[PDB]
């Protein structure tokens, strides 16, 4: 607790942490009930919602999606390149999770009935906190005290555990979600920076770009132990406060230390 307060003071903002050891049931909690902007971290849950829907819509993942240049938004590395041929729902999902591809995430939101559709899926797994209200890129505004496009560190972690380790997805879909998170490319300086190199990690990052607001959540499999699931979110009071990946990694170290890992 005292360490978290010191870290967030140095940062110049607020840090939100929740971590659970799925073996012992132990937890670590700091501002775990407070709302933080989701930023691009919503994209992991979006992929999970797509997976769940495939359980009731045969052939969904294989469905080719065509789009033109009007569908492009900044930060769309994969979707920009496949413009001329389109991409499948699966390829869009991989891009959104592993490269934080913006246009891909919007295309998938459209498949699921928009931000409200994603929110309704999260309510269906028992998450009463999560809300997505807007699309990329507008959802990144991160205005202090604005509840739009936010969740809490505990709600993120609880939902992540249900989807990756629990029964919220059928087995094949659940493994696919884990595989996507394990292949994320954007998280090397966050939770992954806090753990020994031999521990497997799947994660999804978010970065709003204003108000010191960024985050990461992850399932971590320490050598010889049950998985740990955790979320680390930050925010700050000034629009021009910059986020800090090092602060996210530091809070992650405190969390794991707190579970005795």
């Amino acid at each position: 607790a005292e360490p978290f307060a010191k870290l967030e003071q140095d940062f110049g903002g607020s840090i939100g942490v929740y971590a659970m050891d799925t073996g012992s049931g132990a937890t670590v909690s700091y501002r775990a009930e407070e709302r933080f902007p989701l930023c691009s971290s919503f994209k992991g849950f979006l992929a999970a919602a797509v997976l769940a829907r495939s359980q009731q819509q045969a052939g969904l993942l294989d469905t080719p999606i065509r789009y033109g240049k009007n569908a492009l938004v900044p930060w769309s590395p994969i979707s920009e390149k496949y413009l001329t041929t389109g991409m499948t729902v699966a390829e869009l999902s991989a891009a959104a999770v592993q490269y934080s591809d913006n246009a891909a995430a919007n295309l998938l939101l459209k498949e699921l009935g928009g931000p409200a559709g994603l929110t309704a899926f999260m309510r269906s797994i028992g998450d009463t906190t999560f809300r997505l209200d807007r699309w990329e890129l507008e959802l990144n505004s991160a205005i202090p005290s604005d509840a739009r496009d936010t969740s809490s560190p505990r709600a993120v972690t609880e939902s992540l555990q249900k989807l990756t380790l629990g029964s919220a997805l059928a087995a094949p879909q659940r493994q696919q979600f884990v595989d996507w998170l394990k292949g994320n490319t954007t998280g090397n300086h966050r939770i992954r920076a806090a753990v020994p190199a031999d521990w497997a990690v799947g994660d999804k990052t978010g970065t709003c770009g204003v108000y010191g607001t960024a985050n990461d959540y992850a399932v971590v499999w320490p050598t010889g132990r049950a998985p740990i699931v955790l979320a680390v979110y930050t925010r700050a009071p000034n629009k021009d406060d910059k986020h800090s990946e090092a602060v996210i990694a530091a809070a992650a170290r405190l969390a794991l230390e707190g579970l005795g890992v």
Binding site: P74, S100, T205, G206
Partner: protein, 164 residues
């Protein structure tokens, strides 16, 4: 030799081979296969929720294939960003590249993507410009930008974010 850079992006030319691209970008910065298929994707430093990057497309999967497509975000800075919501609104479908540049500002834009589907022929060339207002290019988090896209040098459409 460090990460991918705008200088390296500019050094790479349409027509180069896979090996020439890797030799310039630095192979440790690049990936192929997977989400990228037979294109080569090269990373710079962290920005947005990802990285400044380049992507190079090739005429085929063949080893002797040639670069027919160059894309980047956050590798190249606009020389003099002066785009405004008002200038954006004056851009019209059917304009030439020259007409667009005069309207949004001669130094407002960088090339987001440039593709030659008939390479080496320039017939059917498609181009996306990323254009910025005075403080629009930053961190990768833009304070007002636009996407202007062309086919055969003629504006096909436009979109903006946060312009004023």
């Amino acid at each position: 030799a460090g990460v991918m850079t705008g200088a390296k992006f500019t050094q790479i030319q349409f027509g180069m081979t896979r090996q020439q691209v890797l030799d310039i970008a630095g192979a440790e910065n690049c990936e192929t296969g997977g989400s990228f298929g037979d294109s080569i994707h090269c990373r710079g430093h962290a920005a947005g929720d990802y990285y400044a990057y380049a992507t190079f497309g090739f005429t085929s999967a063949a080893a002797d294939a040639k670069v027919d497509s160059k894309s980047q975000e956050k590798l190249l800075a606009p020389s003099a960003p002066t785009l405004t919501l008002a200038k954006f609104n004056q851009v019209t479908v059917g304009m030439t590249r020259a007409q667009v540049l005069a309207t949004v500002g001669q130094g407002s834009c960088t090339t987001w993507s440039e593709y030659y589907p008939a390479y080496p022929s320039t017939a059917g060339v498609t181009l996306s410009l990323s254009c910025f207002d005075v403080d629009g290019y930053s961190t990768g988090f833009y304070r007002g930008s636009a996407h202007l896209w062309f086919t055969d040098g003629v504006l096909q459409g436009k979109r903006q974010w946060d312009l004023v």
